[PDB]
């Protein structure tokens, strides 16, 4: 999808001083952008069915990260919804 330095501005401004990836709020944000980044490739490539399930698996792994966000995060749960473009 987006290049390492072409989508590192989101992490840096949303992560703590560490300059690295793997954070639950960083992974969810970097995965949501990937879906929107591969959204243009989901149009033309609609005849194929070996990548449509791939996004579902990506959302499935994101569920676990979102499950920890519903644990004890109230202000950190709406921070990745009012800033980006999603539901809830």
């Amino acid at each position: 999808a987006i290049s390492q330095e072409r989508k590192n501005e989101i992490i840096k401004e949303y992560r703590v001083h560490e300059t690295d990836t793997g954070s639950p709020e960083v992974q969810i944000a970097v995965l949501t952008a990937e879906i929107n980044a591969v959204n243009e490739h989901l149009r033309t490539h609609k005849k194929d069915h070996h990548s449509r399930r791939g996004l579902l698996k990506m959302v499935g792994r994101r569920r676990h990260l979102l499950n920890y966000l519903r644990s004890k995060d109230i202000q950190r749960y709406r921070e990745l919804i009012k800033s980006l473009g999603i539901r809830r």
């Binding site: 290049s3 072409r6 243009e40 490739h41």
Partner: protein, 95 residues
């Protein structure tokens, strides 16, 4: 992932106005859904070591185009065969 080095040559007799619209279409199929290129150039008056189709000149505009969707070096190859706009191109798969 799959980088491509396209070195296409334009016709020796083409107006700059049409040349701008000619490179616009080539760059449009190269910088489609993300450019991710290195640096663009614009070679002018020069002589080629090898001769192809016994021409007189030929404008140059070879630019590195790294891709991951593998759709930048697609139409380009077909453009330098069907239509009479490109003569000598390139198809390097080296990173």
């Amino acid at each position: 992932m799959r980088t491509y080095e396209v070195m296409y040559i334009v016709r020796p007799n083409i107006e700059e106005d049409a040349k701008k619209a000619l490179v616009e279409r080539f760059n449009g199929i190269l910088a489609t859904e993300g450019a991710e290129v290195l640096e663009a150039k614009d070679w002018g008056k020069r002589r080629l070591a090898y001769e192809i189709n016994d021409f007189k000149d030929g404008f140059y505009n070879i630019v590195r185009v790294k891709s991951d969707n593998n759709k930048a070096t697609d139409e380009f190859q077909r453009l330098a065969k069907i239509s009479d706009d490109i003569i000598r191109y390139m198809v390097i798969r080296e990173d």
